[PDB]
């Protein structure tokens, strides 16, 4: 039942597409823009998968296989992967679904990510991976209806508690925090509440179906890409994860075209290709070193309550923060217009607020943008700045105009 | 002596850079625009290498190693490789040296050209190659000071003659043809005559130095790429032609910057990356099938007088001609302006011809270009149409204004 990875992955892309689900931007905007929309989306799913993974394993739909603990691997590979995120312009999974979105930079970013991961795994970088392998923590769980034989450590296994107990506690706390905290609001119809339900459901669909083929794990990104490159370059048979990668690329493309969001897109300056190639290049090193990326360790490993995924997840954000500071330091009169068409995700938001605050009272400020997400984030980032959005105007195919009524 | 190829390639890039020597355009412009500048550079070098190769074989610096004849592989793969040339925006070595210039579409084309060649060699296309290999002609020469043991057939070996005779007859006919024939004029200072001298001197240096490494051949491009990818993705040792692949890029990189020609380049519309993406794939499949590319069979094999290299070099032009039809079917007032900045070199020349033809007597035509070659090819294409070029201007570094006074 190997084709089911394409089936799971096809749903995976559509959830990631219409839900804007990118983990690198989620970590960045709690540090840059104090924006938590995608964190509650993460926290909600993680809580739901916590109960889901144990519940599905309890009945007999899966067994959990936590990743083995490697402090040198989880810490250092976690940080290397965090750097690649901001350099690659998106997470490991985010770039993959971005390929079907028509992002030439995502093609370039994905091309090196698989190659470097291949090189880190078996290629010329295999010395650095084999050296880190001398820090493998031998601590293990034992075979049960919960855990595969010889798997890694968990919160439960250390504590001697039955896995239900921390899973019910932590998920409830997360559900409390996400439901009890103020949220920065956008205008995505596939809002973070329902979107987390689908994301956890597909993950549960991922675990049960992938285990049938022989792969005892949920959603993964690095393992599939390496399997794709191998099959194309050494004629090895494709498996569930590589097919899942294929379904993701198709899945994001289908919805992007149905919504009318699809476009072959170029960066504003040609130097960005050199940047995003390095970004994925780092990600291949870090993801392979840590044993998984923002999906293989975070989305699918954190709700499994596994120490190795929990430890590796930490430095995903440290690198996400580290590379962020290095890098990111109708007739309506219009008083000043600023053109941000062709700019990557944070730029339209960054220069829109730089216009209204460096403007007097009563200014009409025009914002010209050609990317879908920015027309939903800009209206919120100006309401707290006192001002008001006059009208969101639809100009050319895929371009929107925002007129701002500046206050004080 | 593996390192000598980076040196040979380093010279190779500078020769290819300042002479603009791309074989895909050499074949293309004899059918499109009846322009023979680059073919003149080709035929002379073939003659010079016809004499050079046999001369060095006589003393003991080298031996000729013609590639064995396979009628299925040379014809079909040669045709397909010709399709990939036009699609990939240039020949096999024609993108590689262009990587050092700063062209992002060549980086994309290089990514698919290498990976397809690795796939067609041992990856997912090994079935096609394994089937094609059953048609290998068992005609072999014998170990001698002129031919390596069990090599392929040649014009000389077929006729029962000494290698000097066909080399001295065919090269003189090439030399007589090139010098007695009309040549389309350019303003490349590194003219076709001297550049043909240096291109054989590098080619001969490639033979003598590489033969000591254990590879008994001169400049070969597709074989070089696979050695790099094997090393990077399988931790295999690099080799002479793998280093030669690097030296071409590093050699052109030095030459592209000193002349002030370096610039990170993007196409006009994002669609070109997918078009050039297929081009590298076709070239990899074609070059591995053909057993040699624009350099492996034409530049290096044709002067060796080998039957297989001639046969594949016939169909390189047929596929080049096939795909060419599918794809291509200051105070000066200025009366009409034409902007072709960012479009590949044929387009500025063609769109400059379209303006003058659809212009009346006395109109001043402004043509803005951002590629150095077009500022050389346009002035000859304007005097051919009766008109006169007024001044070549320097707007921005790397951008030129061409002012044309049209006659009738
Ligand atoms: C603030 C949160 C709001 C929502 C809250 C939802 C709570 C759901 C579960 C809680 C478990 C609490 C601890 C229960 C301990 C039970 C121990 C047990 O059954 O066994 C103990 C021993 O280890 C073997 O017998
Ligand atoms: C017990 C086995 C399962 C354990 C795991 C699942 C736990 C689900 C519940 C968590 C808290 C949900 C309610 C959180 C508060 C929601 C409403 C809110 O934010 O405040 C409303 C206010 O308290 C009044 O008006
Ligand atoms: C645990 C067992 C699970 C078994 C079942 C597995 C699959 C579950 C859900 C899949 C939803 C896939 C489609 C999600 C919705 C598509 C996107 C959407 O809602 O788009 C709205 C649009 O953006 C408005 O403008
Ligand atoms: C063993 C001895 C024989 C084997 C080795 C023979 C090497 C022959 C040439 C090497 C590099 C030539 C590079 C091209 C010349 C310099 C670049 C040039 O021509 O630049 C002109 C410029 O464009 C004006 O503005
Ligand atoms: C990892 C590298 C992956 C590389 C490949 C990723 C997927 C590319 C998908 C679509 C582009 C081709 C279709 C869109 C072409 C431009 C749109 C257009 O002009 O119209 C097309 C439409 O079909 C009316 O004819
Ligand atoms: C027990 C589990 C309970 C939950 C199981 C969920 C399974 C998936 C169902 C629906 C996906 C989301 C569908 C709704 C998303 C928004 C659709 C919408 O607004 O559509 C607008 C329209 O397409 C243009 O105007
Ligand atoms: C479109 C681009 C996504 C990648 C598509 C190609 C990825 C590699 C597929 C591959 O390995 O194909 C060979 C075959 O699977 C050996 O059994
Ligand atoms: C991995 C292998 C499978 C490839 C996926 C296709 C990805 C792209 C999705 C399809 C392109 C959609 C498209 O071009 O839509 C028309 C466009 O809007 C112009 O009219
Ligand atoms: C091998 C097993 C099969 C694998 C392959 C199956 C392909 C099925 C195709 C399409 C269905 C899903 C289409 C989902 C389209 C996105 C939803 C959406 O956005 O539509 C509403 C719109 O946005 C409002 O403006
Ligand atoms: C338009 C441009 C056209 C350019 C020219 C294209 C010529 C045909 C090329 C490839 C198809 C090959 C199909 C047949 C392949 C071999 C059939 C066969 O017997 O394959 C056995 C197999 O390899 C083990 O079982
Ligand atoms: C053995 C190599 C001989 C090379 C020289 C061949 C004869 C000179 C060429 C004259 C062309 C006509 C010029 C007018
Ligand atoms: C035994 C054989 C030994 C062979 C050893 C190598 C011989 C060839 C070396 C150089 C050729 C000329 C190179 C190009 C020189 C002219 C460049 C030109 O046209 O102009 C350059 C000038 O700097 C513009 O300002
Ligand atoms: C796997 C294969 C790897 C192959 C690797 C080969 C070596 C590196 C290649 C080319 C370097 C080219 C460098 C060109 C630098 C140009 C700098 C320049 O001119 O920059 C202008 C700018 O204005 C300044 O601020
Ligand atoms: C002035 C414009 C250019 C400025 C500089 C641009 C960057 C140069 C860096 C490296 C180039 C490659 C050469 C150095 C490395 C060669 C490969 C090597 O070390 O090979 C070892 C061994 O022979 C096989 O593994
Ligand atoms: C491994 C690290 C490598 C670091 C980098 C090493 C650079 C070597 C320097 C010079 C060789 C090439 C000399 C220049 C050849 C082309 C000259 C040129 O541009 O000729 C036109 C002329 O300048 C118009 O006035
Ligand atoms: C293997 C590839 C090695 C690549 C090594 C770096 C190449 C030059 C990079 C940046 C300079 C950009 C300068 C600004 C744009 C051109 C003017
Ligand atoms: C031998 C297998 C491939 C043979 C056929 C090549 C297919 C891809 C390119 C077609 C033209 C696309 C651009 C058309 C522009 C008008």
Numbering used by the authors:
A (entry chain B), B (entry chain A): 1 to 329, 372 to 450
Passage from the reporting paper:
Recently, a selective thiosulfate uptake pathway involving a membrane protein YeeE (TsuA) in Escherichia coli was characterized. Finally, the crystal structures of S. thermophila YeeE-YeeD fusion proteins at 3.34-Å and 2.60-Å resolutions revealed their interactions.
First, because a comparison of StYeeE/D and several YeeEDs’ amino acid sequences revealed that C. pollutisoli YeeED possesses the shortest linker, of 40 amino acids, between its YeeE and YeeD regions, we prepared the fusion protein by introducing the 40 residues between the C-terminus of StYeeE and the N-terminus of StYeeD. However, the resolution was insufficient to reveal the details of the interactions between YeeE and YeeD. The asymmetric unit contains 2 molecules of StYeeED, Mol A and Mol B. In the crystal packing, StYeeD in Mol A is involved in interacting with an adjacent YeeD region, but YeeD in Mol B is not. C22 of StYeeE is located at the interface, implying that C22A affects the interaction. From our X-ray crystal structure, YeeE and YeeD appear to work as a 1:1 complex.
